[PDB]
Amino acid sequence: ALTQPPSASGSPGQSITISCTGTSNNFVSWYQQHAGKAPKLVIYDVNKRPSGVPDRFSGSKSGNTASLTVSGLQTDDEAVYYCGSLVGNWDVIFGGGTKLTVLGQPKAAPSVTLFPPSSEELQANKATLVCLISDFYPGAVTVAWKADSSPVKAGVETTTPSKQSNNKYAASSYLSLTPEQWKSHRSYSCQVTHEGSTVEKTVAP
Amino acid sequence: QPQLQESGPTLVEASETLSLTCAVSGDSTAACNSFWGWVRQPPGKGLEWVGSLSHCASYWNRGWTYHNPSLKSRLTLALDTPKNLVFLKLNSVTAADTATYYCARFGGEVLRYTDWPKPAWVDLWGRGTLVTVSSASTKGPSVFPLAPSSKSGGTAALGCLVKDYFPEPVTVSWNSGALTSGVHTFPAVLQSSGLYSLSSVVTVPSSSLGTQTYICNVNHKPSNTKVDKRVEPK
């Protein structure tokens, strides 16, 4: 498979390079996907640009790692970038995408509020932990949940970061449990990673 | 320049068949320079190859069809070249098949090749069509309070969890619109149950919790439902 970092950022005018590991041939492509839009091919055959793609975009490869460089970032270069490759005889695969933010305000760490299941929801025989994440920039986070000290992956839904009225970002994550499992642990935690550092909140039944 | 336009139903029940059509303009699906097919993308997730085909035969076949191996058992692709149409048929769909489906033209080592053509990249994309797989009927939300503690440096977050509704959308206001500062209403998530949920939050002064009532006003027009949920300190 092809592996890309989840996010990257730089300021307007700067150069940035993002990588895609696991490439095994020269059938490498890159795609730019603006929010809410279809992808667009920006590089094919490692380093070729389709007509109309600005020359600020360039592709390269070193060993099994392909890279896309943008030389002179512009605000409208902010997008998710995917690498693609032919693999096997004739299959196509894609990397997981890198959200590239063009920095337009100071970086800001998230605030986190974790709500336990409400009494009304519990009385309805259901349970949802709600982790609300606010006031962060760039708009890219990862969320991990724990029951006591052990990771929990099942029953998790997380939204793509959404812009707040103050132009920082928010996100939400939900952990669905039975009332029984909620009561069977001493605590649950929601851990948010932003720019390589974490903020974690804990609640107890 | 050439264009690809998807059409077909955008809501498909679980276990049923998802079919889409793509109309190609400004290029010929009968020509041998490209393969024609599909890529999909679940909301908030990455791109996944579906497959592609060509009707340009070598001396040992009638054309070429390549499928994502994990979809092959459920997938049928076709071309109608006189009409310049590409088709997708995906049987027995589940929640995992909810996605934006993009019609796609593939380039690579296609016109000239060794052993077999190698369509490696998508050089033309349709705008995409989001197909939701859910067997849900219209259903108003179950609204639950996200209560603040009576005691974050003097502010209190409070909110409402708006669960298990269909179809979109719901809208949320606070105190009938008298409270707008610090309000954020999140995007909906489509759960594996085939129902949507979202939340809305507002941050207010903790000193207000004993004196000011907070009510979230949830509107779900598809079911002609409004819910005004009081959110009280714990």
User: Which superfamily does CATH assign the domain made up of A1-104 to?
Assistant: Immunoglobulins (2.60.40.10)
Classified as helix, coil or strand, B206 is helix
Name the experimental technique: X-ray
On the CB side of B7, CA atoms within 13 Å amount to: 5
Q: What is the distance between the alpha carbons of residues B231 and B200, in angstroms, rounded to a whole number?
A: 12
In contact, A18 and A8? CB cutoff 8 Å: yes
Strands (E), chain B: 3-7, 11-12, 18-25, 35-41, 48-54, 64-67, 75-80, 85-90, 99-109, 118-125, 129-133, 142-146, 155-165, 171-174, 183-185, 189-190, 196-205, 215-220, 225-230
Q: What is the distance between the alpha carbons of residues B87 and B22, in angstroms, rounded to a whole number?
A: 6
The number of angstroms, rounded, from the C-alpha of A13 to the middle of its chain's C-alpha atoms is: 24
Beta bridge partners of B171: B219
- B114 and B162 assigned to the same domain: no
- B205 and B97 assigned to the same domain: no
User: Taking the domains of chain A in order of start, what are their residue ranges?
Assistant: 1-104, 105-205
Restricting to B residues 8-37, those with a Cβ less than 8 Å away from any Cβ of A are none
Q: What is the distance between the alpha carbons of residues A66 and A94, in angstroms, rounded to a whole number?
A: 12
The residue from B100, B135, B170 where one domain ends is B135
- B158 and B119 assigned to the same domain: no
Q: What's phi and psi for A157, nearest 5 deg?
A: -130, 135
- Quick one: resolution in A? 1.3
- B173 and B161 assigned to the same domain: yes
Q: What's at B45, amino acid-wise?
A: K
Restricting to B residues 182-221, those with a Cβ less than 8 Å away from any Cβ of A are 182-184, 186-187, 189, 191, 197, 199, 201, 203
Q: What is the distance between the alpha carbons of residues B27 and A103, in angstroms, rounded to a whole number?
A: 39
- B125 and B156 assigned to the same domain: no
The residue from B135, B151, B174 where one domain ends is B135
The residue from B119, B135, B151 where one domain ends is B135
- B207 and B122 assigned to the same domain: no
- B20 and B62 assigned to the same domain: yes
**DSSP character for B139?**
B
Q: What is the distance between the alpha carbons of residues B3 and A182, in angstroms, rounded to a whole number?
A: 52
- B117 and B149 assigned to the same domain: no
On the CB side of A195, CA atoms within 13 Å amount to: 12
- B45 and B120 assigned to the same domain: yes
Q: What's phi and psi for A119, nearest 5 deg?
A: -60, -40
- B22 and B127 assigned to the same domain: yes
Among residues A49, A12, A10, the alpha carbon closest in space to that of A31 is found at: A49
CATH number of the structural domain spanning residue B179: 2.60.40.10
**Yes or no: domain A105-205 corresponds to CATH 1.10.3720.10:** no
Q: Strands of B171-174's sheet, edge to edge?
A: B171-174, B215-220, B225-230
- B103 and B144 assigned to the same domain: no
To the nearest whole Å, the CA of A85 is away from the closest chain B CA by 6
To the nearest whole Å, the CA of B175 is away from the closest chain A CA by 18
- What domain range is B226 assigned to? 136-233
- B116 and B166 assigned to the same domain: no
